[PDB]
Amino acid sequence: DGLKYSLATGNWGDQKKAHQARAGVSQVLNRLTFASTLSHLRRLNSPIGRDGKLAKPRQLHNTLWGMVCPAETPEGHAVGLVKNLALMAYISVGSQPS
Amino acid sequence: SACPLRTIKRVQFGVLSPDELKRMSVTEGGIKYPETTEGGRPKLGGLMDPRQGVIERTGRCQTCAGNMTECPGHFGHIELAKPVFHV
Amino acid sequence: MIIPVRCFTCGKIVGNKWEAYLGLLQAEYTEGDALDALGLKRYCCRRMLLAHVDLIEKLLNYAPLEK
Amino acid sequence: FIGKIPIMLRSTYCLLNGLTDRDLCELNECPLDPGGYFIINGSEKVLIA
Amino acid sequence: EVAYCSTYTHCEIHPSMILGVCASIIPFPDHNQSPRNTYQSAMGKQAMGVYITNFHVRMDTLAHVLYYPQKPLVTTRSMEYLRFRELPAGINSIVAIASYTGYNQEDSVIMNRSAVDRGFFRSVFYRSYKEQESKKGFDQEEVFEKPTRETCQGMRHAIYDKLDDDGLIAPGVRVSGDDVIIGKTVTLPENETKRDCSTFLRTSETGIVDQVMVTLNQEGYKFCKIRVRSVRIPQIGDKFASRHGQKGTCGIQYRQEDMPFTCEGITPDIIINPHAIPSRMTIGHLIECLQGKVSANKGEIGDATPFNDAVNVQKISNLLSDYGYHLRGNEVLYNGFTGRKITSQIFIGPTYYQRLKHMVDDKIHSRARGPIQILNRQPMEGRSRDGGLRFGEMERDCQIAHGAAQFLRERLFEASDPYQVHVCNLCGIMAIANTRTHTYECRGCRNKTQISLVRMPYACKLLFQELMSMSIAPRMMSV
Amino acid sequence: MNAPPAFESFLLFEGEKKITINKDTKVPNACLFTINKEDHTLGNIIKSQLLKDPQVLFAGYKVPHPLEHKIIIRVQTTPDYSPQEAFTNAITDLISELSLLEERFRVAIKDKQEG
Amino acid sequence: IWGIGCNP
Amino acid sequence: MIYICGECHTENEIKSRDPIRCRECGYRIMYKKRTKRLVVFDAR
Amino acid sequence: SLKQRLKGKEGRVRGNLMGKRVDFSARTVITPDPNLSIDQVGVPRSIAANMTFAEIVTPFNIDRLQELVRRGNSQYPGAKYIIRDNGDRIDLRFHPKPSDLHLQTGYKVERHMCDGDIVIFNRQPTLHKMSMMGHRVRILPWSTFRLNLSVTTPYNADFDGDEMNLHLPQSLETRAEIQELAMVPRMIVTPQSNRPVMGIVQDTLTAVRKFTKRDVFLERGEVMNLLMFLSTWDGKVPQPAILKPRPLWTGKQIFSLIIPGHINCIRTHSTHPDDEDSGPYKHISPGDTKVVVENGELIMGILCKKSLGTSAGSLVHISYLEMGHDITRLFYSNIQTVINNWLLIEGHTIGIGDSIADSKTYQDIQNTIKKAKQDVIEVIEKAHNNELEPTPGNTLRQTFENQVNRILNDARDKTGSSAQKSLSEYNNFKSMVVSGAKGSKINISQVIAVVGQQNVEGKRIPFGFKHRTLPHFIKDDYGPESRGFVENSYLAGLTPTEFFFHAMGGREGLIDTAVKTAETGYIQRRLIKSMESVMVKYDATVRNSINQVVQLRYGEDGLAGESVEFQNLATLKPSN
Amino acid sequence: QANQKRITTPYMTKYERARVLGTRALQIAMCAPVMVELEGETDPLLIAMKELKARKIPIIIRRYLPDGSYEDWGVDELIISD
Amino acid sequence: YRHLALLCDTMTCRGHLMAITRHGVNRQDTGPLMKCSFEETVDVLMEAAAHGESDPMKGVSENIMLGQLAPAGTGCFDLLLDAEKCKYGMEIP
Amino acid sequence: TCPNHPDAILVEDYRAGDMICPECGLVVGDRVIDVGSNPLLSDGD
Amino acid sequence: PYANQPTVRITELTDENVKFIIENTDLAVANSIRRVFIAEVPIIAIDWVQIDANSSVLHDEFIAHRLGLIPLTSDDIVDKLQYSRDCTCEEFCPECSVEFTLDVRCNEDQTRHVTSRDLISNSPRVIPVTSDDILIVKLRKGQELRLRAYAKKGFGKEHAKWNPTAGVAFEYDPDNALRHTVYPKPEEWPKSEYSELDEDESQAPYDPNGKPERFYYNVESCGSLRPETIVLSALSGLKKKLSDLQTQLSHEIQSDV
RNA sequence: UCAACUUG
Ligand SMILES: CO[C@@H]1[C@H](O)[C@H](n2cnc3c(=O)nc(N)[nH]c32)O[C@H]1COP(=O)(O)OP(=O)(O)OP(=O)(O)O
Ligand SMILES: [Mg+2]
Ligand SMILES: [Zn+2]
Ligand SMILES: [Zn+2]
Ligand SMILES: [Zn+2]
Ligand SMILES: [Zn+2]
Ligand SMILES: [Zn+2]
Ligand SMILES: [Zn+2]
């Protein structure tokens, strides 16, 4: 029930405690077009609040060259706060340091 | 309907007198019962008082024949055992 | 999903030509040569056969809802 | 038995893993479907990074 | 070369891989303005096409599938890995950048009605409705059955003839708005028989039932999903966009006779205003039209990888010159109405145009004396609930600026929440009033004579009562 | 949902007149003809033939709105000629032209085949 | 996108 | 009241308030069969 | 809590009292319609059928309302309800007894909205007073609201998925208020800037420039067709400008018939040479500029944004000031119709042929860029040798950036000027820029010659990586390409590094738009709330609700902002 | 106030014209007698416009000065803003 | 210039610079309901109740809240019926 | 409860939310639908 | 004040194409004839479909649309047939319609291509231009399509399914001599196939006296009608429209006076 | 009621 609830609701935590829960994770997959499905699967979400209008986290940064698509970002109140991976980008799964 | 139609020309704001609250409230003796349901649906002296307002969109409140439209609702009073600061 | 009858812009019947176009492509004709042989001359008609994607075969792969 | 873990589709532990496209068609699942989403309560949910 | 760096340690596989999935479908992205590539990234997500090949099996809400998807005539090499050819979203369209009748002005688009008749940009909209027969109630059972007006005390006057014995409408039956897709009945506890619990079609769906399924859900209760299919022929409100950020509605639809025609007889499927191009600087659109003309004549799908250096506009123009057309792609057009050659030569070429999900039928709403909210006794909100449009505070400020005091009064009081209250003259607090009894009395004064009727919005009455509950007394005195 | 039926473009609904002739008060010997359920096809031919007439001072056709189906034709003739007469004569001339064209096209067909 | 004095 | 079965495509008549299980396969996903009344489709 | 309910937005105080959801309102997508007049709006039939305006039965209108009642809800020009004298409402949909259908004086029949019903048209956000204007209704057979293109400029609406709200007044009193205060023709001129709000736009402006050229000559039949769409025509064909050899009218001759009444106006075309006024041929202009209208006849000049646009002294502004609002409404509509029907003969287009320039021009652009890059290199070498001297008030880094930006900007502008020289008369980009319908000289320059320097946060592209903009460039590279200068044009295509830098600039643009919307909304609301109650009393003093005198006369001269015009005193400047 | 010493503008304000025409039209719709002979005018608002042109509307406008006094200008006395 | 001068005059009318904020606007001695519509809301109402403030009902927002006709244009004046003119003229209906 | 029709069944309506006498069309009740608006676990709490 | 006498020369006449040149005619008449080709030549096409069983992947309305677009031979019967509105009988009868019936089921493992040949008509004259074949739908094993359809007379103004022509090519003044289109650069533009100029000269010298004449046509057919019959029927139909106008105009003229 | 996702 914990795993199922956190996936279904979109709140990352427990049912009793929503104070530390992070909303926006686990959205419903968009099936309007195959392009929308693929882009929804390969999506990054910056944690900076949308309500804040400070422009530094939104601007495209030089280090996003080849890691994140420069053009593809939502236009509106979330410009630059939602990003899509480039075609060749591969996020590291992780390994032991031993 | 017999009352003449008038337009408010001045609104006077003031703190409600406790005596005025007692007189104005249709509920008498206060809300003695936390439960909202007695005799099945209505709890006299409870949170859902038939005299306080119209319920179920078909009933009529005791004070007036509101029929869910005419009645503006009527206030009730709870007599606190010991006084409490208003925030 | 399936080759459209009657090319949209002009209206020439192009729905009878899809299997012939595929066969000519198998015969190692270039796509332009196949379109020329089929009689498609205006670029509006050639657009229909050249850009068509036959998804109905992929749909036919699935087993029928009622046998 | 200590519980159930939701399974991301077409991962290694899903039933669809290592199935030929014909077999995916036999299960009425599209060969071109990317995978990577959980089916929780009947709706496909995607974990945004 | 002239020495810049002699210590390169790594090399890029290809610069076009910096772009993402949605930006990779843009042809000639480097020839566009940057905000336009950003806008096309968003519009491509909303285009219509076969979303997945197993769409017949799936029962999803709001699924649109185009009749005749086509792969782009001018395609990026990276599109192959996105499988855009396998599952395309859009149709190559003969597009003329011209001003014909003024119905393509702003961003609107004149479309060919004959082409629309021949299947151009036709789509299907499937909507699925789910209902669960819940027996969890102690004495409430939501049985699936066909409600009967005489048997059921609670019922509605919408059409119930469609429902079969199981309470589920059979597939293949047309359903108009306000019809009963699924009939469900809750047995009513006899406190001392039936409150209707059927589900009704969304207004103006006007579709035919496609599939009806009956299963048991996770909870084990009987679960029924019904999918309704509606064909959607393009109209004069639907939104069409190209791959270069040019979005617009359909201004008007002219038949093939009325559309301008080349000497060959080709009439543009879509006419877009020339005024869109210059300010937006989407030259990629123009180069795609040129490459599409060359590709349709040559028979090979054009290459539009972002950074090629082997494809230039001059080379495309020479290639087109070989095939008998003007090198820059312009063509001499004839006016459909009169037959006279248009003095300016119009730029006509095939261009991949998409159809977005936003359609006028889903976005049209009208409200007149509909249902009102419980809390505020104000009109509901939303198209589904027949809600009225909000008259915002900025709107009321505009009306104040006009000086239209009575329109402002009607819109903010009489149209929304008219109401009457009885107020004691001696004390501003409202007084109890029995209209049927014709006895009006005020508590706290023991005064019956001095009561006056006051007309106020119900929201204002609620505000004053909420102030009273906070011990504030908003004594409204007529004097 | 609000789309007009296709047959509305060319079918007169009951109680509608194909031609209504209303005189023009502004200028002498001018009439304004309104043709219902017709399009540029008929209007352009009639206007052209009217312009060919030496006694026709003004001749033009207007579709008031493309969504609606109506032609308004304004004909102004010299004195000793009537706008209605000009309209009738224009229609007769167009019919004669089309009939002669049909005969010659049939002859050309017969000559092209087996000749 | 033009210059420093223009627009971005 | 004839339900086609998803798994084995065999029609099974089910009475009201009867479990939704197809005989000969046991599958619980049934589809209602196409209605007998016919709808006129304009080719347009 | 009670305080929580009242305090926040969407609470009773603001979300349910100051603004609230209303009945008799409709919303749908807006699409263009050149044939509709300025005041008319095209309403779909379904929206018109749902919305009903109650009409009192009078002896005058009892027959018409009786026919509407007989038609019922199903037939479109029908009545949804009958309201009796007692207040009883007879819904005609459910069967009414034939006795009930009978009407007598005092009954109120709720007829369906018909052609000519005044409505209020709104598009959020409602920034200014012109965003809510009263439109007459014309029912047309599709499901989109259709408004004239000139009315788009007040609403700031384009037909790319926009939507608008339709409010139908329900009483004769409020209908009259809209008719006589808020109709579109009455609000052509804004009091904000004493300029006309609405002007000829898009195809009609571009085509009016071409129509008004000296070159345009129209034969007899084309004149017939153009005059057919002129609503105010006297029925008299103007005498052709060229009687022999073949009778040929001129574009200005026909446009003179459109001009209302007798309006006198002198304006200058956009391409007016500065030296022309001083030199000879000042009145016989060689380029056919210096629009002059005498006695409501276009003597000379090429119309453009300046003459027919939304600027003070425009032909439309002088029409509203002199002729009145009604004749000006007819003026707008007639310009649109006649010019749009001429555009079928002439036509407009945008193609790659417009973007491409002569080979010599391309070589000149390339040479300018070459010498600019060399100059930037020389500045860099001076800076490295420390020969550069700091500008007063600026650090050496700041002054180096200043000089480098100056060199790059001069090169950018010079290449743009060369590209603009290359443009022919037939070039359509030039047609749209010269007419003012859309675009700018900058856009042509970027299309043809050089995209320009990409600046983020007021500087060249910053060193996101350690001391270099992108991994491909060498550390400590302050050169032109490294810091963002995009040498290639849009037609030529951006190199990949230039593509990324261009994306950075465009992202800054998008972010600025998103931020400005919210901040400006807050400012606007605060100003309105502070000054909402201030008004001109019958003393003509400007007083607030408290009756405190803000101003003794409005504007210190007691005049309204729309009537005033710019004028020159002419006693001030001259010498004694 | 007295009929003499009227300080307000003789011209009818735009808001006064709007409200007078609307109110008179509402009266005409309720079968009030019409002073001006109608030439086949059925719409109440148009008849009200005709009456306003003839200056026969039977309404006197009471203008409230900010000091609390009022000046009663009949519609005939006011010069039409048109 | 009229629109700029009016804002400047409202800000500096009182003699102290009145910011267009909750503080400056609400401090001015307007009606309590009008203050309630702008920002502070409930707190303004509580203070007004405590001090026995009375709303003059001359403001536009206050009249809009209670559903009465605003004192704005088309509400500044009150029309009266002219009996003598009603008698005169041709009363056709 | 149509006043002119003793013992008349009033048909419900969804468009305006009112019960209407079907034989005369009189609207009895103007806007009397509005919105029209776990007991198993435990009891009243 | 009288009609010009036109002439016609037929340069090419094939089974699907007619090229002819109309001379001594006004531009308005020629363009109207071109317009009548597209929108006012009557043809028989399917307009009513009742689908009994449709197990194909394409939905029912998809099949109906594709069936409508299928051309049907209407060479001689279209003149005899009456419009459904004209016929006195309720719905459809053999005088006002032609009945087509289609029954196909795939029992073989191989995919069955439902083609226009599977459409069966009760009337021999109207056949789906078969005497490859147009593919209506492809059927997997166990999938069945059975439908019944009626075909009605109509013209392209109603729907593009009744459009007799594929492409009507209209061109006048092949070498720009009336300067109806002003080329910015005359040399770049390709010469017309009908152009009579030498290669050196791009445009003919301007002729102020000249007016549009000698209009060039190229009419291609979908097989519904013979390409010659399209032209002849268009001329006859335009003549009928003008005659109906003349009758109604005479009625109005007499009634007013 | 809350959340997210779009549309300007
Ligand atoms: C032109 O200004 C409009 C308006 O100001 C209104 N609007 C839009 N979004 C918002 C928002 O979030 N908040 C508020 N308050 N208003 C908003 O939309 C603005 C423009 O936006 P755009 O720049 O995308 O218009 P294209 O230039 O893109 O037009 P294409 O070529 O697609 O038709
Ligand atoms: Mg827009
Ligand atoms: Zn009560
Ligand atoms: Zn074609
Ligand atoms: Zn009291
Ligand atoms: Zn089974
Ligand atoms: Zn009754
Ligand atoms: Zn028959």
Residue I250 has φ and ψ, to the nearest 5°, of: -115, 155
- Domain encompassing residue E444: 383-470
- For I423-460, give one letter per residue: b (16+ CB within 10 A) or e: beeebbbbbbbbbbbbbeebbbbbbbbbbbbbbbeeeb
Q: How was this entry determined?
A: cryo-EM
Cis before I245 (ω within 30): yes
Cα B3 to ligand 5 centre (Å): 14
Residue C39 has φ and ψ, to the nearest 5°, of: 100, 0
- Domain encompassing residue M52: 43-160
Domain check: are M124 and M78 in the same one? yes
**Residue nearest ligand 1's atom 12 by CA:** A76
DSSP reduced 3-state for I267:
strand
Residue E424 has φ and ψ, to the nearest 5°, of: -65, 140
* In contact, E476 and E427? CB cutoff 8 Å: no
* In contact, E149 and L22? CB cutoff 8 Å: no
Report residues 137-166 of I contacting strand N, contact meaning Cβ closer than 7 Å: 158, 160-163
Residues in chain C whose Cβ is within 8 Å of chain E: 1-2, 4-11, 30-35, 42-44, 46-47, 50-53, 55, 58-59, 61-62, 65
* In contact, J72 and J60? CB cutoff 8 Å: yes
Query: Which chains pack against G, by 3+ Cβ pairs within 8 A?
Result: I
Cα L13 to ligand 7 centre (Å): 15
Q: Which of M29, M38, M147 to mutate to test the interface with E (most CBs of E within 10 A)?
A: M38
Residue I311 to residue I296: CA distance in whole angstroms: 19
CATH class, domain I202-346, is mainly alpha
Q: Among H29, H34, H37, select the one facing E213 at the smallest CB separation.
A: H29
| Helix (H) or strand (E) segment spanning residue M60 | helix M60-69
Question: If you count DSSP H runs as helices and E runs as strands, how many of each does chain J have, helices first?
Answer: 2, 2
* In contact, E236 and I32? CB cutoff 8 Å: no
Gap from I5 CA to N5 C1', in Å?
A: 27
DSSP reduced 3-state for L27:
strand
Query: Which chains pack against C, by 3+ Cβ pairs within 8 A?
Result: D, E, H, M
Residue I470 to residue F49: CA distance in whole angstroms: 72
Domain check: are M205 and M135 in the same one? no
Residue E388 to residue L29: CA distance in whole angstroms: 21
Domain check: are M186 and M255 in the same one? yes
In this structure, what token pair is assigned to residue E234?
């393009």
Q: Which of D10, D21, D27, D29 to mutate to test the interface with E (most CBs of E within 10 A)?
A: D29
Residue I503 to residue I495: CA distance in whole angstroms: 12
F63 Cα to chain M: minimum distance (Å): 16
Annotated binding residue C10: yes
Residue of M nearest to F85 (CA): M253
Residue B36 has φ and ψ, to the nearest 5°, of: -90, -10
Return the number of CB contacts < 8 Å for E and F: 17
In this structure, what token pair is assigned to residue A73?
């970002």
| D43 vs C: CB within 8 A | no
Domain check: are M53 and M147 in the same one? yes
Q: Say if F and E touch: at least 3 Cβ pairs within 8 Å.
A: yes
Count CA atoms closer than 13 A to C66's CA, side-chain side. Answer: 19
Question: What is the CATH number for F65?
Answer: 3.30.1360.10
Most ligand 1 atoms within 8 A of CB, residue of I122, I126, I517, I522 to mutate: I517
A49 touches strand N (CB under 7 A): no
* In contact, I96 and I88? CB cutoff 8 Å: no
Gap from E61 CA to N3 C1', in Å?
A: 19
Residue K18 to residue I467: CA distance in whole angstroms: 49
End-to-end distance of chain C based on CA atoms, in angstroms?
22
Resolution in A: 6.1
- Asked which of M101, M133, M160 is the last residue of a domain, the reply is M160
Which chain A residues are closer than 8 Å to I498 by Cβ?
A: none
Residues E145, E148, E152: CA angle, nearest 5 degrees: 95
| C15 vs M: CB within 8 A | yes
Ligand nearest to the CA of M98: 8
Residue J17 to residue J21: CA distance in whole angstroms: 6
Residue K65 to residue K48: CA distance in whole angstroms: 17
Cis before E457 (ω within 30): no
User: Which residue approaches N7 most closely, CA to C1'?
Assistant: I161
DSSP reduced 3-state for E360:
helix
Residue I355 to residue I490: CA distance in whole angstroms: 9
A24 touches strand N (CB under 7 A): yes
Nearest CA among I360, I305, I308 for reference residue I332: I308
The label of the residue with tokens 């052709």 reads I240
In this structure, what token pair is assigned to residue I384?
């490295």
Nearest CA among F83, F53, F64 for reference residue M256: F83
Residue of D nearest to E87 (CA): D32
Read off the amino acid at residue E450. Q
β-strand partners of M224: none
Helix axes I315-322, I325-346, angle to 10 degrees: 150
Looking across all nucleic acid strands, the nucleotide with the smallest C1' to CA distance from residue I162 is N8
Nearest CA among I275, I277, I272 for reference residue I287: I272
Cα B66 to ligand 3 centre (Å): 5
Query: How much is the CA Rg of chain E, to the nearest whole Å?
Result: 32
- How many independent structural domains does chain C possess? 1
A97 Cα to chain D: minimum distance (Å): 24
Query: How much is the CA Rg of chain K, to the nearest whole Å?
Result: 20
Question: If you count DSSP H runs as helices and E runs as strands, how many of each does chain G have, helices first?
Answer: 0, 0
Which chain I residues are closer than 8 Å to L16 by Cβ?
A: 91
Residue B73 to residue B67: CA distance in whole angstroms: 11
CB contact under 8 A, F21 and M252: yes
A74 touches strand N (CB under 7 A): yes
Residues in chain J whose Cβ is within 8 Å of chain E: 14-15, 18-19, 22
* I359 burial via Cβ count (<10 Å: 0-12, 13-18, 19+): exposed
Question: What is the CATH number for M212?
Answer: 3.30.1360.10
| D2 vs A: CB within 8 A | no
Residue M165 has φ and ψ, to the nearest 5°, of: -100, 155
H1-44 carries CATH number 3.40.980.10 = no
* Residues 6 or more apart in contact with residue I463 via CB below 8 angstroms: A62, I469
Strands (DSSP E) contained in I385-525 are: 455-456, 459-460
Residues K7, K11, K15: CA angle, nearest 5 degrees: 140
A 10 A CB-CB count for B86 gives 8
* In contact, I80 and L16? CB cutoff 8 Å: no
CB contact under 8 A, L32 and B35: no
Residue of E nearest to B13 (CA): E474
Q: Which long-range contacts (CB under 8 A, 24 or more apart) does F20-26 make?
A: F20/M252, F21/F84, F21/M249, F21/M252, F21/M253, F21/M256, F24/F74, F24/F76, F24/I235, F26/I233, F26/I234, F26/I235
Kind of pairing between the strands at D43-46 and D38-40: antiparallel
Active-site residue flag, E107: yes
Residue K32 to residue B30: CA distance in whole angstroms: 32
| Helix (H) or strand (E) segment spanning residue A91 | none
Residue of K nearest to I60 (CA): K93
Q: Say if E and A touch: at least 3 Cβ pairs within 8 Å.
A: yes
Gap from L12 CA to N5 C1', in Å?
A: 37
Does the CB atom of residue E107 touch ligand 1 within 6 A? yes
Nearest CA among E42, E29, E36 for reference residue E76: E29
Residue F100 has φ and ψ, to the nearest 5°, of: -60, -40
Gap from I192 CA to N3 C1', in Å?
A: 42
- Domain encompassing residue F8: 1-115
Q: Distance of CA M127 to CAs E231, J69, M130, M165, Å?
A: 29, 92, 6, 18
Residue K58 to residue E420: CA distance in whole angstroms: 22
Nearest CA among I33, I327, I305, I333 for reference residue I195: I305
Query: Which chains pack against H, by 3+ Cβ pairs within 8 A?
Result: C, E, M
Within I117-219, residue ranges assigned H as helices are 152-155, 172-177, 203-211
- Domain encompassing residue C57: 1-67
Read off the amino acid at residue J32. A
Cα I269 to ligand 3 centre (Å): 73
Domain check: are M26 and M135 in the same one? no
β-strand partners of I432: none
Count CA atoms closer than 13 A to L9's CA, side-chain side. Answer: 8
* In contact, M231 and M215? CB cutoff 8 Å: no
Annotated binding residue E5: no
Question: What is the CATH number for C38?
Answer: 1.10.10.60
In this structure, what token pair is assigned to residue I385?
């040798």
In this structure, what token pair is assigned to residue E77?
């090499």
Residue E465 to residue E457: CA distance in whole angstroms: 13
DSSP reduced 3-state for K78:
strand
- How many independent structural domains does chain M possess? 2
β-strand partners of I145: I30
Residue L30 to residue M5: CA distance in whole angstroms: 74
Looking at residue I151, the DSSP 8-state letter turns out to be T
CB contact under 8 A, E216 and H17: no
Does the CB atom of residue E247 touch ligand 1 within 6 A? yes
Count CA atoms closer than 13 A to I484's CA, side-chain side. Answer: 30
Structural domains in chain J plus CATH codes? 1-82 (3.90.940.10)
Domain check: are M144 and M172 in the same one? no
A23 touches strand N (CB under 7 A): yes
Distance of CA C24 to the CA centre of its chain: 11
Residue I562 to residue I226: CA distance in whole angstroms: 34
Residue E371 to residue I123: CA distance in whole angstroms: 25
Residue E476 to residue K55: CA distance in whole angstroms: 9
| E372 vs L: CB within 8 A | yes
Residue I454 to residue I465: CA distance in whole angstroms: 17
| E398 vs K: CB within 8 A | no
> Which residue among the candidates E60, E107, E303, E362 is catalytic per the annotation?
E107
Q: Distance of CA E412 to CAs E405, F89, I336, I409, K60, Å?
A: 10, 63, 37, 55, 13
Question: What is the CATH number for M58?
Answer: 2.170.120.12
* In contact, K55 and B10? CB cutoff 8 Å: yes
DSSP reduced 3-state for E69:
coil
K29 Cα to chain I: minimum distance (Å): 8
I471 Cα to chain G: minimum distance (Å): 22
Domain check: are M73 and M154 in the same one? yes
Domain check: are M192 and M143 in the same one? no
G4 Cα to chain I: minimum distance (Å): 6
